[PDB]
Design a protein around this ligand. Structure first.
Ligand SMILES: [Ca+2]
Ligand SMILES: [Ca+2]
Ligand SMILES: [Ca+2]
Ligand SMILES: [Ca+2]
Ligand code: NA
Ligand code: NA
Ligand code: NA
Ligand code: NA
Ligand code: NA
Length: 397
């Protein structure tokens, strides 16, 4: 009962953490190359705690001379699920994926006609990472109508020398659902059938990088992604070549974890109308130190604003807290979070610093309950909460 008094205030923090970060795929026109540029960050969980980041840079250039749609700035959201086929002797990856355009608020080309139904997909990649060659064959299909891909990947050369997740980004964004108001912004479909070239450089923080080059085009009725990948400067024992990444990753919101999110949701949603406004989000951040402009609040809300109505619908909110427990935060992000409470920087959250936050955030919290709270997390016994004591209060299971 003092336990969830953490889970509430902790999720409220990890929510402002999420709204402050850039988890999507940010697309902008590249008129220079009559094509587009994209950039996003990828979170790879490490099987024994922590996260590997992969900072992605992306060029798309069309293959033919056909006029193409060059979009205003928007983004995609991807939701990847990796599983195994249990009949499958070979090194493989079953990939389900949902891909949705958003980030233009409220107020078709020949190409789209080609994606109206279900389309066969074939993927062929030849890889060299630190000189370990491998090859990968995929088949599956894309209902563009829903933003759904289903694909199976086999490593044709035996054992893959890199964790499968690192390849997911590399192994067909022409299957994104664009909403009706955004159809004039789908370059990918516009470029079909002749195709686009998809070039990426992918930096794994504290490790090597991939250079990828991909022909994505129709061959008959089948959409085909052919890829060369070249990895350099990886560490023999680092997270990639040491296969130290989680494959599976946890997709299970216990009944009870959704309810933790609603208790949080309701800290922002002060009027209980089931949506969070710039006004309400401002109110909570101000009572927690930060002091952002109208501009920042709109851009934070627009990071998670599916319907593009300029507010966080209770559902839009759950989606984002689901993400933020699915993928591990970085040490930078946890520190930023700590420093919301550790309002002096000494590396310890005092009884008197928890009060300052709790009672600035608007809760009764008499000097009895405040201490019941501290004691909850205080493993080493010191009457204060240190950074590693904090990371325990901010994890699942
Ligand atoms: Ca509200
Ligand atoms: Ca919304
Ligand atoms: Ca302190
Ligand atoms: Ca302590
Ligand atoms: Na340009
Ligand atoms: Na073209
Ligand atoms: Na190669
Ligand atoms: Na690039
Ligand atoms: Na290459």
């Amino acid at each position: 009962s003092s336990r969830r008094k953490w889970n509430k205030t902790g999720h409220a923090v990890r929510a402002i953490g999420r709204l402050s970060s850039l988890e999507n795929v940010y697309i902008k026109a590249d008129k220079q190359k009559n094509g587009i540029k994209a950039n996003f960050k990828i979170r790879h969980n490490i099987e024994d705690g922590g996260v590997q980041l992969a900072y992605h840079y992306q060029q798309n250039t069309p293959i033919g001379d056909g006029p193409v749609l060059l979009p205003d700035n928007h983004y995609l959201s991807v939701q990847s699920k990796l599983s195994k086929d249990p009949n499958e002797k070979r090194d493989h990856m079953v990939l389900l994926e949902f891909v949705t355009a958003a980030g233009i608020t409220l107020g078709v080309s020949k190409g789209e006609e080609l994606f109206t139904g279900v389309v066969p997909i074939l993927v062929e990649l030849d890889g060299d990472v630190n000189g370990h060659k491998f090859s990968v064959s995929g088949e599956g299909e894309g209902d563009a109508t829903y933003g759904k891909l289903t694909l199976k990947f086999i490593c044709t050369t035996g054992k893959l020398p890199v964790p499968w997740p690192t390849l997911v980004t590399t192994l067909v964004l022409c299957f994104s659902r664009y909403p009706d108001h955004m159809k004039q912004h789908d370059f990918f479909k516009s470029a079909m059938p002749e195709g686009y070239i998809q070039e990426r450089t992918i930096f794994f923080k504290d490790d090597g990088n991939y250079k990828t080059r991909a022909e994505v085009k129709f061959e008959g009725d089948t959409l085909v992604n052919r890829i060369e990948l070249k990895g350099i400067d990886f560490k023999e024992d680092g997270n990639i070549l040491g296969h130290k990444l989680e494959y599976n990753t946890r997709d299970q919101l216990t009944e009870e974890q959704i309810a933790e999110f609603k208790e949080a949701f309701s800290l922002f949603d002060k009027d209980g109308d089931g949506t969070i406004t710039t006004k309400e989000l401002g109110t909570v951040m101000r009572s927690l130190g930060q002091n952002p402009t109208e501009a920042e609040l709109q851009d934070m809300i627009n990071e998670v604003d599916a319907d593009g109505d300029g507010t966080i619908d209770f559902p839009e909110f759950l989606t984002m807290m689901a993400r933020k427990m699915k993928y591990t935060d970085s040490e930078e992000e946890i520190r930023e979070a700590f420093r919301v409470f550790d309002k002096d920087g000494n590396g310890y959250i005092s009884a008197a610093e928890l009060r300052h936050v709790m009672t600035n955030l608007g809760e009764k919290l008499t000097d009895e309950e405040v201490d019941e709270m501290i004691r909850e997390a205080d493993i080493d016994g010191d009457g204060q909460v240190n950074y590693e004591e904090f990371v325990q209060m901010m994890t699942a299971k």
